[PDB]
Swiss-Prot record, chains A, B:
Family per similarity comment: Belongs to the alkaline phosphatase family.
Record keyword Ubl conjugation present: no
Record-linked PROSITE patterns: ALKALINE_PHOSPHATASE (PS00123)
GO MF: alkaline phosphatase activity; hydrogenase (acceptor) activity; magnesium ion binding; oxidoreductase activity, acting on phosphorus or arsenic in donors; phosphoprotein phosphatase activity; zinc ion binding
EC number: 3.1.3.1
Gene that specifies this protein: phoA
GO cellular component, one term: periplasmic space
Binding site for Zn(2+) 2: 46, 364-365
Keywords, alphabetical: Disulfide bond, Hydrolase, Magnesium, Metal-binding, Periplasm, Phosphoprotein, Signal, Zinc
Residues reported to bind Zn(2+) 1: 322, 326, 407
Name of the protein in its database record: Alkaline phosphatase
Entry binding sites for Mg(2+): 46, 148, 150, 317
Species of the source: Escherichia coli (strain K12)
Active site (record annotation): 97
Length: 444, 444
């Protein structure tokens, strides 16, 4: 159960590549606790399967290096995340972000595109909803529009993840449409859910006006304000916040859509590893210093949520690992994994210091990227990258002739730390995670 | 630390897809043992990453199913397997089978193509040579030619894995060539290594005559016999074997090249999932009933080997998983994964009965195959398959425009059962596995 998993020394020498310093048996036996967790932090790297973890490590930390956050969770396993076909109720082997997010927040499988509803379009409570109910503080942070599938699955029950605001819901989720007797669009259900801390992007959807109810006529922003929400739009005002609770819930909207990626790099191209020079990522100049980082949001949320006595449940999402994977952009993809590692370090530090916190880091599904030989002549999109090792690493995206590269169905890594972390070991299902959290918190 | 990891019931219903029937903490705590291992069984699925495991599971057992052998190992983790560039000594992110086999059997990283030698071309003792020196019984079984990288890494030290017999060694590994005063070709070093039980294919190379030494002019097959080896070439004679030890070593040559694949199916094609109908794998009609299956060989090996009082070390390899992945043949690949699972069940059944046996199942590196959506328009080779679920699963191979799909660098699953199994949890390196075994056996 070491906290240092980096190669021991000279990787070309006997035992120099080893990551293990001694015997884990005692150490591991000592990290196995079935006492209840008081808090739970679930970090989700969108689309971050093992391939994505390995490439970012190879790049940012080197083959023999290790993520001080992502790689430091002692209890590990692999979990399945297949979705269901709506008609047949038969497995659909490659899930989308909505059906998967619904799985751990609800504990029930569903079809691709569904948020908070099973294949019968029946609503099921999310873990955030049950937490809030038991008196725990709740947080939801992401680098994507808050209406996006991952953060949304915790506060909304909609038939199509496309129903962001009143106007998309009216036409695509008419039974959820507010003016039709429904609970409302994702943004509206988010505002109703009223989690203590909610941070991310997606401010543009808040400019839509409600079509029915009490705040009908007022934009969703005005409604948030009318309801007691503190609204912050940058790093400065975020840090300024001193409390967030059911009286003064916090709401951060740091971008119209998704928050900017941290690194810039060209898009992978056909024969790019052969015809184009190896690339070295650089910071993204479009991204402002006023826009908080995932670690910053994670840290602030923990500070505000840790004030609650029953405890808290927080979910953090490094959203754009997925987005840049779809875009066949290695740099944007690696930057987002590094960004997430930071958020995991913040969490682990709190967890270790507090001692009753279960921390879980995993991904909702696998994605396109593969690490291939430098000389690979692949049919898809490729790019050579200069790693920290001073060597070249080639990444391939070859599962779509369309612009967007697709998700994949491979089981992926799930790692945990803290009370009830043993339930993540071995083969499990994405729906088991729901039960693991529900029981760790004794949230029954 | 459970044995049944299949979905609980109706996967369309809340909790119906869970694989956990309770809480693992106590169960796992109980499976954590640092007592010495008396025996070790290392099963290797060549090129069997988590993606390969998921595809074969979805196909053979259904998405909510579980491999009774492969998925029944309680302790799990992910391990790295990058090779080294021979000139620079810097990491080569995608390893080949030779460099990877060498890492776990030797404890040192090396370049691609090297067997039993570091980047300096210096020999290092293998775990089989060390067990043999300690008085333990040694077994080496594989479905590939015995001169192949995986089984060979345990008994040969050659600068190029292409140095099979006398002739190839002369031109490619002249410094190993028997005439130039070298230890010999792979086949000759295997003969000299004298493990108690050696079973696989590769009889073709045994038809070569040594160029120098006591048996020069005599075929390698005759030499084996002159040295006291029991030669068996089919199931009947194999099963006939009563004992195998240092005075009566067992040598089984079941095929000229690789042993035949279990299932038949067509090769994936460009737009195969779209232009062609879903395929259903069938048993291989050319596979002679008299050729042993990996499990039968594993079973017989364990039986002969378990007669040694000091204990034994056995390595089993499901070699064609890799080959069929290279060949872009889903059916052959899945069949070879099902094949290996059967071998794992035999291993586990024994381990559970004996109680001082460490069983480990992993792969040497990742591979090409990806599970993609049914409607995917991939630039590579694809194919639709009818699964146990009666659902369609699409497999994609898009990392090579050559005739062979390539290995990939993603970290992959390693699972263990038995004393010292805890050393497999978390992030580790392929070289740690060497140390885990050496320590488990007290083979200092
Ligand atoms: Mg997302
Ligand atoms: Mg092999
Ligand atoms: Zn996703
Ligand atoms: Zn996606
Ligand atoms: Zn291999
Ligand atoms: Zn291969």
């Amino acid at each position: 159960v070491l906290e240092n998993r980096a190669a021991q020394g000279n990787i070309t020498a006997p035992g120099g590549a080893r990551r293990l310093t001694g015997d884990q048996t005692a150490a591991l036996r000592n990290s196995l606790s079935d006492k209840p967790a008081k808090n739970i932090i679930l970090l989700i790297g969108d689309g971050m399967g093992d391939s994505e973890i390995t490439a970012a490590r190879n790049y940012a930390e080197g083959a023999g290096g290790f993520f001080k956050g992502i790689d430091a969770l002692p209890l590990t396993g692999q979990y399945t995340h297949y979705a269901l076909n709506k008609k047949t109720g038969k497995p659909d082997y490659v899930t989308d972000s909505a059906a998967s997010a619904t799985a751990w927040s609800t504990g029930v499988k569903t079809y691709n595109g569904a948020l908070g509803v099973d294949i019968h379009e029946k609503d099921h409570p999310t873990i955030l909803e049950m937490a809030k109910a038991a008196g725990l503080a709740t947080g939801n942070v992401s680098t994507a529009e808050l209406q996006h599938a991952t953060p949304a699955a915790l506060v909304a029950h909609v038939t199509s993840r496309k129903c962001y605001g009143p106007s998309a819901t009216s036409q695509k989720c008419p039974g959820n449409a507010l003016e039709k007797g429904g609970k409302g669009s994702i943004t509206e259900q988010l505002l109703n859910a009223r989690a203590d801390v909610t941070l991310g992007g997606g401010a543009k959807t808040f400019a839509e006006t409600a079509t029915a109810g009490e705040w009908q006529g007022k934009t969703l922003r005005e409604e948030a304000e009318a309801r007691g929400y503190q609204l912050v739009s940058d790093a400065a005002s975020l840090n300024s916040v001193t409390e967030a609770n059911q009286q003064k819930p916090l709401l951060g909207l740091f971008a119209d859509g998704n928050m900017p990626v941290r690194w810039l790099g060209p898009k992978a191209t056909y024969h790019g590893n052969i015809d184009k020079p190896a690339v070295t990522c650089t910071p993204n100049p479009q991204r402002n210093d006023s826009v908080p980082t995932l670690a910053q949001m994670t840290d602030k949320a923990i500070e505000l949520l840790s004030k609650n006595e029953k405890g808290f449940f927080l979910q953090v999402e490094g959203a754009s690992i997925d987005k840049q994977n779809h875009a066949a952009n290695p740099c944007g993809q690696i930057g987002e994994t590094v960004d997430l590692d930071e958020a995991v370090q913040r969490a682990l530090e709190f967890a270790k210091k507090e001692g009753n916190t279960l921390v879980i880091v995993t991904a909702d599904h696998a994605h396109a990227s593969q690490i291939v030989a430098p000389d690979t002549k692949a049919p898809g999109l490729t790019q050579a990258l200069n790693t920290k090792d001073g060597a070249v690493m080639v990444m391939s995206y070859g599962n779509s002739e369309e612009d967007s590269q697709e998700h994949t169905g491979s089981q992926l890594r799930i790692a945990a730390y803290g009370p009830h972390a043993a339930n993540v070991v071995g083969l499990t299902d994405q729906t088991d995670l729901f039960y693991t959290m529900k029981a760790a918190l004794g949230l029954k």
